[PDB]
Swiss-Prot record, chain A:
Descriptive protein name: V-type proton ATPase subunit D
Family of the protein in this entry: Belongs to the V-ATPase D subunit family.
One GO term (biological process): Golgi lumen acidification
Functional description taken from the UniProt entry: Subunit of the V1 complex of vacuolar(H+)-ATPase (V-ATPase), a multisubunit enzyme composed of a peripheral complex (V1) that hydrolyzes ATP and a membrane integral complex (V0) that translocates protons. V-ATPase is responsible for acidifying and maintaining the pH of intracellular compartments.
Residues annotated as signal peptide: none
GO MF annotations in UniProt: proton-transporting ATPase activity, rotational mechanism
GO cellular component, one term: vacuolar proton-transporting V-type ATPase complex
Topology term for the membrane: Peripheral membrane protein
Record note on quaternary structure: V-ATPase is a heteromultimeric enzyme composed of a peripheral catalytic V1 complex (components A to H) attached to an integral membrane V0 proton pore complex (components: a, c, c', c'', d, e, f and VOA1). Interacts with RAV1 and RAV2 components of the RAVE complex, which are essential for the stability and assembly of V-ATPase.
Keywords per UniProt: Hydrogen ion transport, Ion transport, Membrane, Transport, Vacuole
Keyword Kinase: no
Membrane among keywords: yes
Subcellular location: Vacuole membrane
Swiss-Prot record, chain B:
Protein name: V-type proton ATPase subunit B
Originating gene: VMA2
GO molecular-function terms, A-Z: ATP binding; proton-transporting ATPase activity, rotational mechanism
Species of the source: Saccharomyces cerevisiae (strain ATCC 204508 / S288c)
A GO CC term attached to the entry: membrane raft
UniProt entry keywords in alphabetical sequence: ATP-binding, Hydrogen ion transport, Ion transport, Isopeptide bond, Membrane, Nucleotide-binding, Phosphoprotein, Transport, Ubl conjugation, Vacuole
Quaternary structure annotation from Swiss-Prot or TrEMBL: V-ATPase is a heteromultimeric enzyme composed of a peripheral catalytic V1 complex (components A to H) attached to an integral membrane V0 proton pore complex (components: a, c, c', c'', d, e, f and VOA1). Interacts with RAV1 and RAV2 components of the RAVE complex, which are essential for the stability and assembly of V-ATPase.
Predominant location: membrane
Family: Belongs to the ATPase alpha/beta chains family.
GO annotation, biological process: ATP metabolic process; endosomal lumen acidification; Golgi lumen acidification; intracellular calcium ion homeostasis; pexophagy; proteasome storage granule assembly; proton transmembrane transport; transmembrane transport
Keyword Transport: yes
Disulfides per UniProt: none
Note: Present with 131000 molecules/cell in log phase SD medium.
Function: Non-catalytic subunit of the V1 complex of vacuolar(H+)-ATPase (V-ATPase), a multisubunit enzyme composed of a peripheral complex (V1) that hydrolyzes ATP and a membrane integral complex (V0) that translocates protons. V-ATPase is responsible for acidifying and maintaining the pH of intracellular compartments.
Amino acid sequence: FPTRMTLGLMKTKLKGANQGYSLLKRKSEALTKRFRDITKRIDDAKQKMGRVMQAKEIYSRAVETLVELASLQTAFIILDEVIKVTNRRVNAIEHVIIPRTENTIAYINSELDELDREEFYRLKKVQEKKQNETAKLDA
Amino acid sequence: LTTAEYLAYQTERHVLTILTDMSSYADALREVSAAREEVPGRRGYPGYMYTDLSTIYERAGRVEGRNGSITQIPILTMPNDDITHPIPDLTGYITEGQIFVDRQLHNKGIYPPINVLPSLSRLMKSAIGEGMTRKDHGDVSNQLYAKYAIGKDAAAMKAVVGEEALSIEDKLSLEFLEKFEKTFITQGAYEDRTVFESLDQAWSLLRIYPKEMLNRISPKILDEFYD
């Protein structure tokens, strides 16, 4: 499990999750601004539609614009939900994925360093054994 | 091994050798090497183990003029469920192909947990095609591997992203993956199925995916079974 390749894949996934977190953050900001402008426009359209409510023809050119504003409103709501999902994804990319990847990378690094230390210790013991044998044969 | 050799070179019959708990044998060899105070390798294994392990893999193969065939099928347990270990690495590098067993699928409760990703066969080339099994064999095999890989990537995506299964393609890929996992992957321990039955089952399992969704299937293979 504790391999250098696995550490590389985890690190790459971590960096990708970081860049994705930044992108999702900026996207959440833009979506927030857009939903805000669409919200102000929704209020303005609410006042406009509330202006004349309760005759002759040409009424087909009236309710149409109100329908467009309604479409913009629904799109604004969907944008709000999507912004919520984006914020949730950003929150999941903050203290969840990042911490897990960091901890995993730390543990893997510790395991690899410890294994390398053990191998180096065994090699040092082998070299010491050979040196001792040579020193014994030299006499 | 000498018994199998004596069976192949004299009795002239089909022989199958199997070594159980080869990891214990490797540990024993490592112990013998450690007692000799020689230069230890990875996981305390011997330096000449490369020739030793090969000698364990040299118990297979047929001969010219001999009707009998000896094939060794050793079995070992990877330490700490890690195939990256020297034993499994050497066993995989020396021998052609390896059978891997996932612990998760075994923890699922389904039948035998073979992971098609790590699993491969180098003898599946000349043993495929018409005259052996079917002309739809290799194509459906490659298509199965591609579908499994796509399903795996779609699973990782499903883990990273939402539950919407990443639009269309990844959804069908994940569905086909789960279907192949609950059906094709598990045939049951007490059930023995032929190649034609597996081919038909795979043909029924590939009906979920579109005909143009398979890039691993040629024109003839796509026109092979429309039934």
